[PDB]
């Protein structure tokens, strides 16, 4: 213990001096008179200062303070020895704006000596004052008007509250409807009983006010320590008791509560407890980070990750791959002059009351005088479509469990482009699957096509069945062969190279376009007498190919 000296806490800074004090001593009364200018966080500082105190040797006083939401910050106070401030009083509470509650619900303070004092606390209910009645050592039957300001405490902090039931009628992807089922009795009904929430005059009721805000944890509390709070979205007041919260984010835990708004002169009020609900699933976000890469001629690799909220529970990823035709040589572009090696792509709220009050009084004034007294799919599904020749897939698709982030294909059309989706899908709610027809689904995300190509080919293009002829034993030598069985893209030029088997001789090669073979699929080359060797190869829009095996001829 420390038995710290009592004093006047003119500000939060001076409150810091009282940190760790378990007992407060000093004949003069401890005084709390903290203002709060252009700031917040009065509660944390004060409690950090006084939370340790458990007994006050002298009386306690707190007055001329703003933003002091409550006196509950005495987190350990249980005794007030009550040495006074005046000889009659031991707790002195005066002119405390926005002060609304004494000690916490499970806390009691023993006023050892003297009575209490309360006046001009506009936000503190009189009934909350009487909670102290059984705690005093004197055990009085009630508080005298001289000690408690019955008609000057909490005059606009009404606390005759009664609870309101609330229920959700319907929810949707971005909206929900709210009811209030505890029937408020706007205007005394004069026949029936029940309806405890009754307004003696119908004009006195402005309307229900709906509060709602996003809360992933579903534990947000009504009030706040800061005297100003704007996390709640406050709706306009209506008397119907029905509201339709809209522009909501699907599949997010919302929290809401309602309060009845009445003219300043009406004492009765009502509030509901904080309730929670979810906004149903929506369209899952498009798959992020997707990227595709080549593995080999007939095999491609796809990886993706889901880095944004799914708006639901993933049921299965869906992968589709459509063959997109490989490029065709542009006939207006020359070859054997520009050969190809094929580099490849890829605030104040303060409700005002004057208008309604004036209208209400004018109504009464009038009646007293008038009366007298006498391009994208929607049908994703498993599917494989093997080409007619049956070597490669022209369309491949599959479903995957939601935990499989990567997938590979096989038996592709070797060198070619491919367009692929990576789309997520979420589970269907009963109201959709057993209440709606198969249209407007929207239960699967959009996709961003990724274009990727395979590798050229393991053995690449080749020209088999080569043979060379020399007829009439006067005609020039000629070469014969067959085009590639499965050429990459299409062959653009045939390049027949040959060499002379003699020292100081180097291979030199012709160059012709893919055409000029329609007559017999044979090509003729003049040559002089000697022993030579030939070797043909093909060139394709996919790039250069490999030579065949050599051949030989002895010209003469």
């Amino acid at each position: 213990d420390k038995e710290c000296s009592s004093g006047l806490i003119d500000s939060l800074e001076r409150a810091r001096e009282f940190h760790g004090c378990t007992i407060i001593t000093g004949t003069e009364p401890l005084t709390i008179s903290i203002k709060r200018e252009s700031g917040a966080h009065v509660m944390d500082e004060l409690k950090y200062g006084l939370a340790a105190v458990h007994k006050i040797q002298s009386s306690l006083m707190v007055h001329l303070t703003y933003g002091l939401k409550s006196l509950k910050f005495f987190q350990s106070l249980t005794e007030i020895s009550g040495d006074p401030d005046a000889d009659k009083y031991a707790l002195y509470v005066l002119d405390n704006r926005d002060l609304d509650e004494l000690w916490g619900p499970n806390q009691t303070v023993f006023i050892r000596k003297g009575g209490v004092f309360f006046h001009f606390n506009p936000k503190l209910c009189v009934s909350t004052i009487n909670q102290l009645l059984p705690m005093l050592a004197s055990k009085p039957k009630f508080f005298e008007k001289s000690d408690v300001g019955a008609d000057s405490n909490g005059n606009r902090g009404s606390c005759g509250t009664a609870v309101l039931n609330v229920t959700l009628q319907s929810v949707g992807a971005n909206s929900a409807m709210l009811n209030v089922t505890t029937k408020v009795e706007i205007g005394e009904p004069q026949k029936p009983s029940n309806a405890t929430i009754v307004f003696k005059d119908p004009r006195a009721f402005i309307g229900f006010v709906f509060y709602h805000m996003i809360d992933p944890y579903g534990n947000s509390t009504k009030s706040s320590d800061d005297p100003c709070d704007d996390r709640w979205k406050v709706s306009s007041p209506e008397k119907s008791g029905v509201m339709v919260l809209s522009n909501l984010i699907p599949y997010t835990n919302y929290s809401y509560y309602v309060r009845t708004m009445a003219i300043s002169s009406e004492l009765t009020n009502a509030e509901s407890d904080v309730k929670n609900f979810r906004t149903n699933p929506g369209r899952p976000s498009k798959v992020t980070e997707v990227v595709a890469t080549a593995i080999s001629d007939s095999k491609i690799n796809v990886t993706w990750s889901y880095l944004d909220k799914p708006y639901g529970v993933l049921t299965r990823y869906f992968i589709k791959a459509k063959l997109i035709n490989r490029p065709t040589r542009n006939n207006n572009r020359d070859y054997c002059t520009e050969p190809l090696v094929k580099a490849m792509e890829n605030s104040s709220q303060e409700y005002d009351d004057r208008k309604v009050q004036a209208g209400m009084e004018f109504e009464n004034a009038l009646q007293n005088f008038i009366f007298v007294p006498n391009d994208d799919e929607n049908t994703y599904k498993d599917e494989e479509d093997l080409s007619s020749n049956k070597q490669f897939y022209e369309v491949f698709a599959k479903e995957l469990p939601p935990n499989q982030t990567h997938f590979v294909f096989e038996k592709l059309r070797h060198f070619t482009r491919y367009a692929i989706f990576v789309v997520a899908c979420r589970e269907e709610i009963p109201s959709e699957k057993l209440r709606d027809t198969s249209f407007k689904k929207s239960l699967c995300s959009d996709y961003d096509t990724v274009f990727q190509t395979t590798k050229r080919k393991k053995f690449a293009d080749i020209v088999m069945d080569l043979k060379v002829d020399l007829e009439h034993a006067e005609s020039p030598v000629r070469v014969r062969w067959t085009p590639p069985v499965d050429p990459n893209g299409e062959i653009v030029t045939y390049e027949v190279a040959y060499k002379l088997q003699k020292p100081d001789q180097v291979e030199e090669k012709k160059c012709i376009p893919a055409a000029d073979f329609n007559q017999t699929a044979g090509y003729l080359i003049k040559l002089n007498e000697g022993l030579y060797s030939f070797r043909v190869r093909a060139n394709s829009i996919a790039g250069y190919g490999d030579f065949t095996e050599v051949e030989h001829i002895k010209v003469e």
Binding site: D201, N368, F369, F371, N374
Partner: peptide, 24 residues
């Protein structure tokens, strides 16, 4: 007095209100 001081600030009955009429 008129009406409101008779039937708004306090309750009225089908007679206490029957005097404001020409017929019944």
């Amino acid at each position: 007095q008129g009406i409101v001081e008779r039937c708004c600030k306090k309750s009225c009955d089908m007679k206490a209100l029957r005097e404001y009429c020409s017929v019944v």
